[PDB]
């Protein structure tokens, strides 16, 4: 059920990218991959089917193809309009639920230096803890390209249930910021020796712990 | 040319009962298998229904089996979603698409189904919650206790449980801007939103400059002032 893709590609204007989609046999193995674009109000659109036909009105800088376990879309002349997120897709008819997409990918135009990001992890504030709750709040800012993957640890242990990630958003000076937050009961925070916020950008992952037993 | 229309979205309580339509135009609609995908905000997209020409072959996404039902009304070029049953968690914008159908093995082969929609919709938002209007309640994010010499501090408020959106926030009345953020909401499993707000600042300031972030929740005709100080340890 998991077409993966990178989550961030990007390259100067005129060069060429490549997006690549992993699953298995009794998915991209079997069956047809599509492609498609969206962008924030547009209506997606498709620029592959059947592993590698453009339909009418899809220029030929876009191109598809697949061989055994991953398929891959290239983009060739990327311009301004290209940025974008990207999604594979296919339809595997041997099971009789619907169709899967892929986890998506950000496609950056490079316009301007890349930017690391500066990382802020927050343990819950004792107000909220008197109220019965503790959010964990990792603040991510000054990046580029705008792409981040977040993951969150209590002690050494990953922790996927209480999570949840904003999409990165242009900040005044034009580089990126983004937010995750981790909900916890009282308990829970009080109940491990650290949690960590692990954000990946670009070949680097900066961490961030807290711990309820320190001043952070 | 080739379009597509939805509508019916909206905000709806959990357990109640929606139904969006498409129309379309411009092609053969008798011609082509139609479906709905759905995409939540900062999410990935979701196949939810899918529906063949003649409308006797339907499938569903596994989140939405047995609660949502696919139709359509050749006749009048309509493909109906009926979503019963409606979970938080089903908020999210709803696409009508076209399936790029196939020819005979050029004639156009009605029977076809291959999957790939090459005409999307702009979609139709269904925000699913069961909160009447409600102020947020505002949490502060105190600067690190180890900021305690030069360099800068980051320091914010946590703006949490309110509905409907929008919240909007500022620092000191305003006074404070550069340095400011102040990221999108999200939707938690309460069907309450919730955000944060952030401003970098001179760790040298933080013994001497007050910082107050400015909530407003104009639905509720709410507005809160939350001084954010620096943590004793």
Known sequence: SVLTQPPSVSAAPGQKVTISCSGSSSTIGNNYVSWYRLLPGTAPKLLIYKNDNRPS???????????????????????????????????????????????????????????????????????????????????????????????????????????????????????????????????????????????????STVEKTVAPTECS | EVQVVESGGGVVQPGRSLRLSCTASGFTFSNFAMGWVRQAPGKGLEWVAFISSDGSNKNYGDSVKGRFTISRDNSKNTVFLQMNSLRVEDTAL?????????????????????????????????????????????????????????????????????????????????????????????????????????????????????YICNVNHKPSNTKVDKRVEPKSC
Not at chain 1, 86 to 109: A, E, I, N, P
């Open chain 1, 57 to 203: 009105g899809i220029p030929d800088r876009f191109s598809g193809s697949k061989s055994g376990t991953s398929a891959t879309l290239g983009i060739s002349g990327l311009q301004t309009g290209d940025e974008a997120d990207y999604y594979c897709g296919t339809w595997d008819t041997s099971l009789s639920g619907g169709g899967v997409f892929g986890t998506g990918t950000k496609v950056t135009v490079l316009g301007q230096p890349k930017a690391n990001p500066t990382v802020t992890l927050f343990p819950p504030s004792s107000e909220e803890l008197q109220a019965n709750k503790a959010t964990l709040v990792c603040l991510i800012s000054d990046f580029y390209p705008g792409a981040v993957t977040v993951a969150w640890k209590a002690d050494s242990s990953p922790v996927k249930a209480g999570v949840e990630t904003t999409t990165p958003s242009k900040q005044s000076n034009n580089k990126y910021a983004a937010s995750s937050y981790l909900s916890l009961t009282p308990e829970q925070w009080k109940s491990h020796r650290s949690y960590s916020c692990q954000v990946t950008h670009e070949g």
């Open chain 2, 94 to 210: 709803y696409y009508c698409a076209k399936d790029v159908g196939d020819y005979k093995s050029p004639i156009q082969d009605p029977r076809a189904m291959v999957g790939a929609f090459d005409l999307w919709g702009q979609g139709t938002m269904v925000t699913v919650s069961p909160a009447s209007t409600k102020g947020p309640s505002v949490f502060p994010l105190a600067p690190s206790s180890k900021s305690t010499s030069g360099g800068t501090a980051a320091l914010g408020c946590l703006v949490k449980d309110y509905f409907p959106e929008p919240v909007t926030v500022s620092w000191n009345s305003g006074a404070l801007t550069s340095g400011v953020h102040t990221f999108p909401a999200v939707l938690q499993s309460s069907g309450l939103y919730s955000l944060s707000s952030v401003v970098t600042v001179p760790s040298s300031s933080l013994g001497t400059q007050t």
